[PDB]
Structures are given as structure tokens and as C-alpha cells.
Amino acid sequence: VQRLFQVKGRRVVRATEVPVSWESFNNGDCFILDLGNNIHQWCGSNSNRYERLKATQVSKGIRDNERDGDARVHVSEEGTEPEAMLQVLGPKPALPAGTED
Amino acid sequence: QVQLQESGGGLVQAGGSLRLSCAASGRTFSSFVMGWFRQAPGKEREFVASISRSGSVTRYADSAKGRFTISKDNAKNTVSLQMDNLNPDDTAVYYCAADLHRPYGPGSQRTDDYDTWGQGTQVTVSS
Ligand SMILES: [Ca+2]
Q1: Does domain B1-127 have CATH number 2.60.40.10?
Q2: What residue spans do the Gelsolin-like repeats cover (chain A)?
């Protein structure tokens, strides 16, 4: 039960599902690692305001609507990942940049 | 598979002290929130103290403020609980716990926020 979604954009933001792996990550967007009863909101350092606001909405949906409330949403920042994220993805590499939005 | 193991419980007299420790084993990549719970005979599982990933912000149950001091050692990957001025209402099995999902702040007072636990240690304060 693992999914990853990329949250990329500006004023129109898209949440697209992606491989569960560090390779999918970049330092400029937000990602949502669905871990069942725990949901990880991870935003790159160079994330924009919009992505982080939509990222929060995407998280809400999984908990409220796919996990019927039974889920905690943990917000973290590039370089300060929860031990549980590193357990799943292995140790984080120097992440590549994000593209234009 | 991070594991937890408690040590250092034992017997103590009403007024005495005791120090509990929890060693985290298995592969880890970073620091994490840890906490102490206890369970008395009859009674159910209750919070005692929890600490943030860095050891910087702590929280204490009502029974616990003043007498207990929680600290963390991140290279050792342990957690400690110093228990001063013990009375027999403190007699219980004391459990180590970890919240690997929390990225900042101490742990909460609920057990369901803790995902990793040890098998406990016995603490007996007799009057
Ligand atoms: Ca972006």
C-alpha cells in the first residue's frame, strides 16, 4: 500500500501519481507519499506557495476520503524527512532540480 | 525494522529514584520522536513523557512533571527516563515507544501515534 504523487504547478496545479522512489522526487515541487494510515506531505525547498496549498488538499482527500479519517498527515521539508520516509525510500540523495511550472 | 528495548527497571522504595533507558536497534537513517508509556496492574496504557527528534522539546504527563526528566542521545540512538521521588502509584510496566512518522514536535499522549514499541520493563515502588 504505497503511492507517490507529484504536486507541480502554479495557479493550476496537478497531482500526478509517480513511482514510489526518490528518483521521482525533485527539489522544486511537492510530493505526497501515501503510506496507508500515515500520509507524508513533502515539499522541496524551491516549492511554490500554490503547490504547498494544493499538496495539503491532496493529503486531506486521502485521509478524509480514502482512509475514512483513519490517517495522519505529516508535513516535512527537503532535508528533514521523517525516519519513516527514509525507511521506505532509503536515504535521500542530493535531489535534482524541478522544471519551470 | 527498527526495534526498541527497555532496560534499567527494578525495585525501589517510596521516595527513591530510578533511571530507565531504551536502545533502538535495526537500521535507521535519522533521529525520531520517542516516548515512554506505562501500564499498571488493572489500569491501562498511559503516557508519561515524550521527546522531539532532536531532544529539544519535551512533554510530560501530569503525574510526571517535576519528577521525571526525558532526554535523548541520537548517536547512541537511546532515550532515557529519570524518575525521582517515586511513590507506589508509579508501579507499572514501563514501555518504550517511537513515532517514526512525526517530523517535528514531541510525541502525542496517544498510543496510536506510536508505531514501534518495546516489550517493557518492570518498575515497582513499594511503600
Ligand atoms: Ca515547482
Answers
A1: yes
A2: 13-85
